[PDB]
Amino acid sequence: GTTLINSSHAFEYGPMPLVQIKFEDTNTEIPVSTDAVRFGRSFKGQLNTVVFFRIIRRNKDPKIFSKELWLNIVNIILTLYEDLILSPDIFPDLQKRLKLSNLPKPSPEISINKSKESKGLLSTFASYLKGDEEPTEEEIKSSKKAMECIKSSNIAASVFGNESNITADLIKTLLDSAKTEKNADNSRYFEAELLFIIELTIALFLFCKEEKELGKFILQKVFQLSHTKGLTKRTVRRMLTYKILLISLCADQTEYLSKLINDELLKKGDIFTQKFFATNQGKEFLKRLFSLTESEFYRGFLLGNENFWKFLRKVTAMKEQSESIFEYLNESIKTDSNILTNENFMWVLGLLDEISSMGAVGNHWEIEYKKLTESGHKIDKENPYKKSIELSLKSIQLTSHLLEDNNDLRKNEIFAIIQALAHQCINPCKQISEFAVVTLEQTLINKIEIPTNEMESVEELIEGGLLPLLNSSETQEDQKILISSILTIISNVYLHYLKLGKTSNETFLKILSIFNKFVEDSDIEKKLQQLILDKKSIEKGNGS
């Protein structure tokens, strides 16, 4: 009897299509629809609605409800939604907890703006103007009364703001009432209603988290509704945020997360574009994913996936997000230090190398830097990529520290760390290169154990470190600085580890062989003679 929900049961079939008038006096919008006008001309319907929602509000029994009653409540709520009466923003707290903002309002049909609020009668006739059908001001009066009656009712608090009506039946019927077809009749509120239903059902699930089966069902429904076609981009974005939230709330849904990562994040494209991950919302999405890296259940899968790390490499190439990725990585390494599993090393080291390779923009600034310094002039705003340069330095420091706190390496990761430090040592940036050589020297002299069963021969250390780098010196003029740094590090490491006694003169023999490989140009030869004098000095010193 609420004259809003009905069933399929004059000479013109015209159902009076929906039109909206927004006026100009203040900011007040009035929808005019067939359901709206029928509600405006039915006092009995107004009484029925107010009493029905009062009864729903007071009813302190979840079990005494029926399935048909739940369906009727949902249908009334949805009908008020589609008539532009019920405010779509039902749960502002959930939107603020995430970083979404003001669910897409169900758009009206063909709309007419009424600048003047007054009566009609003999006016605006025989002088062009007009033309639209438009409400006859009685429909306008009725629609105003309809909005007033609905606001006098407290639908939002009556149904959801009860804390006892929110049981599995409500979420189930809300999901089952969703629409999966874009009919021409309901084209104006398809995506909006999808988002509204998803958000409201997720909020109601938040109110009752200790229902595992309901969680699985709601996740399945959300995924099925998301994989549909003909959805605008913003709908896909919001549903992505909702999907990651639901995955976080549940306990063991590894397959769904795999589907999310692979299908949505890696393959979509042109949707998860550059700007999407910098909109205050992509940051929330990424923070949710990284927090999901720390959980009782979603740990082992998120470690050994290689598609998670492929996506991490994709998002760490983005200029703005690099600092956030580095902060997450650094916190994970410092706090528990268990993110580095037995097989995770190459991926995380790749992420570190990517965040340390900002020497591109470093030398981009350095171009004009050297252009103005080679002249007798002055530059004040220095290192426009100062954030990027400091990030690269912190990444190299993170690698240096990463060579520690494990103590059970396989020497493959040792070679990898040394190679990564060298590869950054090739970098154009002067500060980056200097930090790389300094930290590589420090790590080599006081961070790798010499007489360990893992690696008990410094020859292999040198030959998996500097030797592989110098074997690829085919960069023409760029080889001179790289070789000078390589040999300088070699000499320093050789001296430092000789000063601590030790044995295996094959170390000396191999270093001599490397020097012979670079014996040309005689500058390396004089360096060899100098370190030979240093060798004699160390001989005397260790003797006495």
Task: Give one DSSP letter per residue of 22-62, joined into a string.
Answer: --SSSS--EEE-HHHHHHHT-HHHHHHHHHHHHHHHH---S
Rounded distance between C-alpha atoms, residue 300 and residue 297, angstroms: 7
Cβ atoms of 396 and 328 within 8 Å: the answer is: no
32 forms bridges with which residues in the sheet?
Answer: 19
31 forms bridges with which residues in the sheet?
Answer: 20
Cα distances from 192 to residues 90, 156, 159, 198, in angstroms, run: 13, 18, 21, 10
Rounded distance between C-alpha atoms, residue 141 and residue 145, angstroms: 6
Give the Cα-Cα-Cα angle 233, 234, 240 (nearest 5 degrees): 95
Q: Is 116 left (phi over 0), alpha (psi -120 to 50) or beta?
A: beta
Helices (H) and strands (E) in the chain, counts: 25, 2
Element (H, E) at 513: helix 506-517
The pair of structure tokens assigned to 196 is 């509204």
405 by Cβ neighbours in 10 Å (0-12 / 13-18 / 19+) ranks as: exposed
The pair of structure tokens assigned to 94 is 């959930």
CA end-to-end span of the chain, whole Å? 107
The pair of structure tokens assigned to 139 is 């429909």
Output b/e per residue, 211-228; b: 16+ Cβ within 10 A: eeebbebbbebbbebbee
Strand-pair category, 19-21 with 30-32 = antiparallel
Cα distances from 243 to residues 13, 20, 221, 233, 285, in angstroms, run: 42, 34, 11, 15, 10
Rounded distance between C-alpha atoms, residue 490 and residue 492, angstroms: 6
Rounded distance between C-alpha atoms, residue 413 and residue 360, angstroms: 26
- At residue 45, the 3 state secondary structure works out as helix
Cβ atoms of 111 and 21 within 8 Å: the answer is: yes
Q: Which residues contact 515 (CB under 8 A, 6 or more apart)?
A: 487, 524, 525, 527, 528
DSSP 8-state code for residue 378: -
Rounded distance between C-alpha atoms, residue 235 and residue 20, angstroms: 24
- At residue 207, the 3 state secondary structure works out as helix
Rounded distance between C-alpha atoms, residue 131 and residue 544, angstroms: 110
Q: Which residue has the tokens 């500058």?
A: 523
CA 63 to chain centre: 40
Pure H helices in 357-385: 359-373
Q: What residue type is assigned to position 425 of the chain?
A: C
Q: Which residue has the tokens 């690269």?
A: 392
Which residue, 251, 194, 199, 270, is CA-closest to 227?
Answer: 194
Q: Which residues contact 490 (CB under 8 A, 6 or more apart)?
A: 462, 466, 511, 514
Rounded distance between C-alpha atoms, residue 287 and residue 389, angstroms: 24
Resolution in A: 3.3
The pair of structure tokens assigned to 18 is 């929906």
- What experimental approach yielded this model? cryo-EM
Rounded distance between C-alpha atoms, residue 82 and residue 106, angstroms: 7
Quick count: other Cβ atoms within 10 Å of Cβ 448? Answer: 22
Quick count: other Cβ atoms within 10 Å of Cβ 76? Answer: 20
20 forms bridges with which residues in the sheet?
Answer: 31
165 by Cβ neighbours in 10 Å (0-12 / 13-18 / 19+) ranks as: buried
